[PDB]
Design a protein around this ligand. Structure first.
Ligand code: 3PE
Ligand code: LMT
Ligand code: C8E
Ligand code: C8E
Ligand code: PLM
Lengths: 482, 13, 900, 10, 150, 99, 49
């Protein structure tokens, strides 16, 4: 009587014996990432910026972030085996990525050190899958810091948290429950993971579906930028900024076909693999879209304030793709960046509004180089790359002066979770109670006041830790005060 | 549609 | 099966028969002391949550072992049986009486005995049939919701539609949007204004009628029982169909047969079988308990009354409209024919036994059986539907397989060692095996209802990965049990056992459990005869029991597939792992006393008990840093101290006029003893409950303190701060506190009355559950003026604090509600479980024709009376929260019975 | 690898 | 049922259900195959055939030399069959061969699906004449109706 | 090549059956086992696990009821290359394969 | 029946071909039996034909 029962479709965990076992674990790593560094996860913090008002259609889903309903945002989200969403979700998927990249990095170091690879080329590649896993850990921890550590500018906080990062765990350890690393602890782990990888990863990108040296240079320049290290951000930018060219569009139809194509956008540095049958998801929060036969109708739960619509020149290719005047019928704009990739339609004819997970496009690299060059007094190269990015978009900028950078960035990065961070760093408070709503939508997009004001240095621009992580871990210092 | 106003999850099922 | 030392309740046939729901454990709510049954959904298809003597564990199931004619069967398979074939149910609620059962005998065992034949001269044939209707059982929630233009004003004055808008501007705009939207559909473009009025500010749409209906229940059966020399037969076929009262479709119908057969073959052998099966179709409303715009009982409270799902004949349209909508929104009946569903379960249950009696005293009994269930289910998305996203349709076919083996063979040697010592010794072996399996296939792209074979789908970006899920477990057990009897007054029972489960690793799956017990006939030793006391017996037991009801594969450290591209597979870490995971070890001491007064026409049994759960299987939650959700561990401990007593007697036996009552009560204090990682408390996020060592599973919130009459703001009590109690308008999570309200209600009980006036008889069965509390998640929406201003609200928001309206208790408009005590409702209730008036035809009406011998007729009601303070539909329809409930139904039934 | 040669069918 | 002397009413019914569940693999990593990738095909079958066939039969005698037997009856035969099957391919491990774990793209397939039903309605009669227990005649008429024809 | 593609294979069967009854009632019950393995080495088999219960009872001078109940768990597999010409299989194989 | 089945040509639209020829008058096969028999028992019902 053997009462052993073991589950079908599962195998037991083991150390890496073969190169083919290692390569398979690296793929499972990138699979997770695709459902983690995912636009669906960054929409919450995009909706918390100064750009959105809720419509009459919302059902208290986007209202907590747009109207700063702190009483709901405190323990917002889910991360159980039925739903993974929100703040709780954002936190949970990245820790799994960090946990699961930890077990990949450690078990590749183990295999290399026991010479289980059978020749020098297997050996040489695992030293390279290793750098990739190092970048993944750097991304995982920094995304967790992006939302769960304070910017230096915050005023009143819970005592202790002003200098704390997130719980740093460098080993695959499910049972680990420790305290928060300090800010400099977390950030030195992030930058060193990245630096060690730029040493090993080859100069020129090998696959847009995997971590490349071009990618890490870009991700580091992003991370430097939010750290205020403008000189260092500009140095990693220039190392990637010219390797990816801008979309050659004559009108906004030539623009939209190229931009919306995961496959043909020459600006995409690093994306996750997606097909119509695997790795494609619908991202219809910003736009409210749904199919109707051969068509698409839109019922958004949130739409930009007029000042966002007024940001875009009328001939800006983005003003019909990133935002699109498709509210009511032709009456107002919604944020439409994540609308679709047609290549993922089950049927050519019928849209399903599915997209893929993109991780970095050279546009941001242009804006990281432009802002930093302005900060470091390098006007020529700040003006070069900003005139280029905007002219290729059909709306070249008159002057180059940070004010213009703040606008241009805001236009180009709409929908990607970037405005909330930018208003913290540019020291802009939330004027949502005072922005004009779009006139065309009178009666559908009305003003709703904040449930709590958001002035410069307000603590809730930084999220509280999930209530799971707090209740099970007395060694956790929370961010928000009493 | 659906209104996640907020569900207190049924932590006693 | 049960023993002289155990707490044992026995429920009779009549408590079981002809009940208009397929959930037979509902029929026991308030019949057994200490057994707390509760059905949280009126969905025909739902099965109750029984708990004997408290909640047994904070992570394992507390479900009793359910047993039918010797072998474990699931409630789901019990539901496919005809309960008019049950002779009796026996609840075994202490360590001595549950000593020969395993798996989870820590939760009590429910033993159902099906009828075996009565050895009469002519056999008794008997035919039962009844018809009846289900309704909703409480309407009060919508007594005080705003009317159509009552909320129109509310919305406009709150600024929801615009800054500078009048009611009529909005009224013009909404029906403007309904005519242009309807005006794009051939099937609607010129029915709006003729037969369709989707928006109508002059009539209030009956949203209760929109989403709920009266529904019927039908039952019948024939039963041939008879007998002869050594053989006994009971055969029956029968039919049941209970339709769902929610208009969202759900139903449970079964076509059943049963044959129970037992025969003495010779003075050395007795063989027997009891065989049963069913063809069964069940379907369930899968939207209840979630919040979807205009569905469920939430829909009937939340849909603005200016929205008409009806047409011009008062019948339910194909579609209603809501302002802003991209698409007309399908009503519930038109959704169903557009999203069809069927499922057939074939259920087979074969059961044999052999009883060799080779010498005086010895009984070799081998018993074995199968429990086969193949279920085959279909799902469609009807194509060419003009209110769907695409004209293209899909189809999903699944097939399910559950096979359950169980062998359980025994040797029983009873003898006598002199004239005052009776010993009965018995040991046995038992192997339980379960192997289950689910397969599912789906295609899409169909463009014809008549061309929808799965093989006819589009092939390309339209293809699907199949569905496939497997599951197996096994239990190996050796057990023993001895019964020593001194004189005819003193009884000792001893038992030891070993259980081994597939659900634990090889080095940790065995576990030993024991039990001792004694019954002492104080009457028949120390009171040879008394003129008023008839029965006085003292019971007492200690024992240990296992609980293994967890989830098959929760120990392995597993990897699964998680492909990143299409040309090579990928592997991700799947589970954390607990190499040490093993049995949960429960221990129960029971002190009993059973007494009979007058001429055992007035009986009672009181029992005191201490149920201790150590090595408790907690699915300990993990910090999200871990990259996991949970991991089972034998961690923590719990206590359930309590008493249960029951009594029954007759109040006026008058030779032709008997009056009978019976009552039963349990109280059970729960105390957690140990948590995990030395932690003293763990609040379970977004649930409003908390585990804290000193106390039981309690609720955990901020104390809501009303509003500031000077500002209109909400105020909450700050725990620990006082004056010479402190309020604040600044809400924070650190404002929350343990509340002296426990989640599982400590008091479970019921009573039942009965009189019989020569053939005419009335029985009433009551059941109560006090100390119950629930969060009315529904009121989070119906009562807030800070958000969801689409939704209908309670008319109390017409009172909202403003500068001109003070001296009100409803807060200013503009602030969202928090999950505090203002939603902790007292879900305690008395309920009238059934009223049955029956009239058995006179005996002499059948004195000339030797074909029919008797008849009975009856009127009956399930769930008419519900005394409770709860401001929601059903106070049973929830545990810790109540969201969008399918309320239990109220039934009216007429029935007839014939005997030949 | 089948040898059709000739399949006089049944 | 036997209500009065001579006649015999017999009612009979039954089902004949067959649920059959079938599994098939093409084992991965075997070096004498075309690919190292594995395949798996699961099918499920269902045959339910019910039939009711109830009779009324009258036997009587009009003399010591004339035995008569009359019987007529009804019969409905139904058959409902059904076959469902799904398959995946691309597996790279003995232990990871759930259908739901296959490759998805050019490796996906259409399911297998087939249904078939038939039905029979019929009324029959049969008589028996017996004279002096040496001469015996039997006569019968019946009508059959099959779903297999228009 | 005969030994390559054909084997000696086993057939196994067993059965117990309780018959009796007495009055107006009669029972015939049986459980049983059968397993026939196919002699072609190309795998093929028919095994069944059987049960049956037959029952008849006179209830009264007008009514007699009865059932016969039968079921089985069965596993069949068949040599599907036979009756076709494939290089190294079947009796064609055993005759045509160069020795 | 004289029937159509699906025969898709691409992946974005349904296709339809003629499936079965048809016989609206198809009906029962009508068989007929004339049978002349004889049974005989010989000796002391120890020989039958
Ligand atoms: C009195 C009759 C004697 C009863 C037979 C004693 C059976 C004890 C065998 C236990 C073996 C075992 O470990 O099975 C566990 C295994 C996993 O899984 C298993 O397969 C368990 C197999 C159970 C076999 C039970 C067969 C009982 C046969 C009854 C005899 C018929 C008498 C009628 C005449
Ligand atoms: C009557 C006697 C029947 C005895 C059955 O004997 C049973 O054997 C099985 C394995 O065969 C043991 O099983 C156990 O030990 C075996 C060692 O062989 C392990 O491989 C197995 O994982 C574990 O469950 C049971 O613990 C024992 O109870
Ligand atoms: C008119 C008389 C009523 C008879 C109804 C009987 C319905 C029985 O259904 C059970 C179906 O299960 C079939 C499996 O058969 C098992 C036989 O094995 C028993 C041998 O011991
Ligand atoms: C009134 C008729 C109700 C119909 C119920 C029929 C049950 C059909 O189930 C089919 C699947 O069950 C298989 C039975 O298995 C046979 C038992 O095997 C044990 C014999 O040794
Ligand atoms: C009475 C009839 C005889 C009883 C026979 C008892 C047989 C037990 C044999 C099975 C034990 C191990 C089998 C393999 C597993 O484990």
């Amino acid at each position: 009587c053997e009462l052993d029962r073991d589950p079908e479709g599962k195998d037991f965990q083991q150390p890496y014996t073969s190169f083919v076992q290692t390569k398979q674990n690296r793929d499972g790593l990138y699979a997770l990432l695709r459902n983690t560094e995912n636009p669906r996860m960054h929409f919450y913090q995009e909706l918390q910026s100064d750009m959105y008002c809720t419509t009459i259609t919302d059902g208290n889903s986007l209202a907590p972030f747009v109207n700063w309903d702190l009483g709901i945002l405190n323990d917002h989200g889910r991360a159980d085996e039925d739903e993974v969403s929100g703040i709780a979700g954002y936190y949970f998927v990245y820790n799994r990525l960090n946990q699961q990249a930890n077990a990949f990095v450690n078990n590749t170091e183990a295999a290399l050190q026991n010479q289980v690879y059978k020749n020098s080329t297997e050996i040489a590649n695992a030293k390279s899958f290793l750098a990739e896993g190092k970048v993944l850990q750097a991304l995982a921890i920094w995304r967790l810091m992006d939302r769960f550590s304070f910017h230096e500018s915050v005023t009143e906080v819970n005592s202790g948290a002003k200098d704390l990062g997130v719980i740093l765990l460098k080993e695959y350890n499910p049972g680990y429950i420790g305290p928060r690393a300090t800010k400099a602890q977390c950030y030195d782990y992030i930058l060193s993971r990245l630096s060690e990888a730029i040493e090993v990863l080859p100069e020129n990108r090998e696959s847009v579906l995997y971590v490349s040296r071009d990618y890490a240079y870009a991700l580091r320049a992003r991370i430097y930028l939010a750290l205020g290290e403008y000189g260092k951000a500009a140095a990693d930018a220039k190392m990637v900024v010219d390797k990816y060219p801008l979309i050659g569009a004559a009108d906004a139809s030539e623009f939209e076909n190229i931009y919306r194509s995961d496959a043909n956008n020459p600006e995409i540095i690093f994306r996750g693999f997606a097909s119509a049958t695997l790795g494609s998801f619908t991202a219809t929060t910003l736009n409210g879209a749904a199919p109707a036969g051969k068509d698409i109708k839109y019922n958004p739960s949130a739409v930009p304030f007029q000042w966002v619509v007024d940001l875009y020149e009328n001939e800006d290719f983005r003003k019909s793709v990133y935002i699109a005047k498709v509210v009511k019928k032709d009456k107002g704009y919604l944020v439409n960046k994540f609308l679709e990739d047609k290549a993922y339609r089950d049927v050519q004819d019928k849209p399903n509004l599915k997209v893929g997970a993109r991780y970095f496009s050279v546009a941001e690299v242009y804006l990281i180089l432009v802002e930093s060059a302005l900060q470091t007094g390098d006007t020529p190269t700040a003006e070069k790359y900003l005139k280029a990015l905007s002219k290729a978009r059909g709306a070249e900028v008159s002057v180059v002066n940070m004010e213009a950078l703040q606008a241009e960035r805001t236009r180009e990065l709409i929908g990607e979770g970037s405005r909330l961070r930018d208003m913290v760093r540019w020291s802009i408070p939330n004027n949502h109670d005072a922005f004009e709503t779009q006139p065309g939508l009178e009666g559908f997009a009305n003003t709703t006041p904040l449930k709590a004001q958001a002035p410069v240095g307000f603590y809730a621009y930084t999220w509280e830790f999930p209530q799971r992580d707090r209740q099970t871990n007395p060694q956790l210092i929370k961010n928000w005060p009493i | 549609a659906s209104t996640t106003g907020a569900n207190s999850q049924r932590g006693s099922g | 099966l049960s023993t002289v030392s155990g707490s044992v309740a026995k429920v009779s046939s009549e408590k079981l028969a002809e009940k208009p729901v397929a959930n037979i454990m509902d029929a026991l709510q308030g019949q057994v002391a200490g057994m707390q049954v509760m059905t949280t959904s009126g969905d025909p298809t739902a099965v109750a949550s029984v708990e004997i003597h408290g909640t047994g564990s904070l992570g394992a199931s507390s479900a009793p072992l359910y047993i039918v004619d010797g072998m474990q069967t699931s409630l789901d398979v019990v539901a496919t049986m005809n309960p008019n074939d049950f002779e009796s149910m026996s609840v075994l609620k202490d360590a001595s009486a549950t000593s020969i059962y395993g798996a989870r005998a820590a939760n009590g065992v429910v033993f159902i005995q099906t009828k075996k034949g009565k050895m009469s001269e002519r056999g008794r044939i008997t035919f039962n049939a009844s018809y009846g209707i289900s309704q909703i059982l409480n309407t009060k929630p919508l007594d005080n919701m705003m009317t159509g233009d009552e909320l129109l004003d509310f919305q406009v004055k709150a600024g929801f539609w615009g800054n500078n808008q009048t009611v009529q501007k909005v009224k013009d705009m909404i029906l403007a949007g309904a005519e242009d939207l309807y005006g794009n559909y051939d099937s609607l473009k010129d029915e709006y204004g003729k037969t369709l009025f989707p928006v109508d500010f002059n009539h209030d749409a009956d949203w209760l009628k929109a989403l709920f209906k009266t529904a019927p229940t039908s039952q019948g059966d024939i039963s041939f029982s008879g007998g002869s020399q050594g053989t006994s037969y009971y055969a029956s076929i029968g039919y049941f169909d209970q339709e769902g009262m929610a208009r969202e479709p759900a139903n449970f119908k079964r076509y059943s047969g049963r044959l129970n057969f037992e025969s003495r073959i010779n003075e050395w052998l007795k063989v027997g079988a009891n065989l049963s099966g069913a063809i069964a179709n069940r379907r369930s409303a899968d939207y209840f308990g979630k919040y979807y715009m205009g569905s469920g009982t939430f829909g009937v409270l939340t849909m603005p009354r200016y929205y008409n799902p009806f047409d011009v004949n008062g019948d339910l349209a194909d579609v209603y409209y809501m302002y802003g909508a991209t698409r007309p929104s399908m009503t519930e009946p038109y959704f169903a024919k557009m999203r069809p569903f069927s499922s057939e379960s074939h259920q087979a249950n074969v059961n044999g036994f052999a009883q060799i009696t080779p010498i005086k005293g010895l009984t070799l009994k081998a018993q074995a059986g199968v429990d086969i269930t193949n279920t085959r289910t279909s799902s469609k998305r009807m194509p060419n539907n003009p209110y769907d996203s695409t004209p293209l349709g899909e189809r999903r076919e699944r097939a399910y397989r559950d096979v359950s083996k169980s062998f359980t063979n025994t040797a029983e040697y009873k003898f006598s060692i002199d004239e005052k010592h009776d010993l009965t010794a018995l040991m046995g072996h038992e192997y339980i095996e379960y192997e289950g399996d689910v397969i599912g296939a789906s295609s899409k792209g169909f463009e014809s209802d008549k061309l929808m074979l799965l093989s006819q789908g589009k092939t390309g970006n339209s293809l699907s990965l199949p569905e496939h899920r497997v599951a197996e477990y096994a239990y190996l057990s050796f057990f023993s049990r001895f019964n020593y009897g001194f004189d005819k007054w003193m009884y000792i029972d001893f038992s030891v056992r070993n259980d081994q489960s597939s659900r634990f690793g090889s080095n940790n799956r065995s576990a030993w459990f024991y039990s001792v017990g004694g019954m002492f006939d104080i009457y028949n030793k120390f009171i040879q005869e008394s003129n008023w006391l008839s029965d006085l017996r003292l019971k007492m037991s200690y024992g240990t029991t296992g609980n293994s009801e967890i989830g098959n594969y929760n120990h392995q450290a597993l990897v699964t597939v998680n492909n990143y591209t299409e040309d090579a597979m990928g592997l991700s870490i799947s589970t954390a792992g607990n190499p040490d995971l093993s049995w949960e070890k429960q221990s129960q001491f029971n002190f009993g006393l059973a007494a009979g007064a007058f001429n055992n026409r007035l009986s009672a049994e009181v029992d005191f008990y201490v149920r201790t759960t150590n090595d408790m299987l907690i699915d300990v939650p993990m910090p999200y840093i871990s990259g996991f959700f949970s991991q089972y561990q034998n961690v923590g401990s719990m206590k359930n101290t309590g008493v249960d007593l029951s009594l029954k007697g007759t109040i006026y036996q008058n030779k032709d006029w008997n009056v009978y009552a019976s009552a039963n009560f349990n109280y059970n204090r729960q105390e957690i003893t140990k948590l995990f990682f030395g932690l003293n408390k763990y609040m379970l996020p977004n649930t409003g409950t908390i585990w804290e060592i000193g106390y039981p599973n309690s609720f955990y919130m901020a104390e809501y303190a009303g509003i500031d009459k000077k500002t209109g703001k909400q105020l909450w009590y700050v725990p620990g701060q006082v004056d010479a109690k402190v309020t604040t308008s600044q809400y924070s999570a650190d404002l929350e506190t343990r509340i002296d309200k426990s989640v599982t209600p400590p008091i479970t009980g019921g009573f039942s009355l009965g009189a019989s006036w020569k053939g005419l008889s009335l029985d009433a069965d009551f059941a109560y559950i006090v100390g119950k509390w629930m969060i009315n998640n529904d009121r989070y929406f119906t009562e807030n003026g800070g958000g969801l201003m689409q939704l209908n609200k309670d008319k109390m928001l017409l009172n909202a604090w403003t500068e001109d309206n003070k001296e009100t208790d409803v807060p200013k408009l503009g602030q969202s509600p928090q999950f505090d005590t203002h939603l902790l409702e007292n879900a305690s209730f008395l309920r009238l479980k059934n009223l049955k008036l029956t009239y058995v035809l006179p005996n002499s009406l059948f004195a000339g024709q030797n074909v029919i011998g008797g008849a009975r007729v009856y009127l009956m009601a399930r769930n008419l009376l519900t005394v409770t303070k709860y401001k929601g539909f059903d106070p049973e329809a929830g545990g810790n929260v109540g969201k969008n409930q399918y309320p239990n139904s109220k039934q009216y039934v007429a029935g007839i019975q014939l005997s030949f | 690898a089948s040898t059709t040669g000739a399949n006089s069918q049944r």
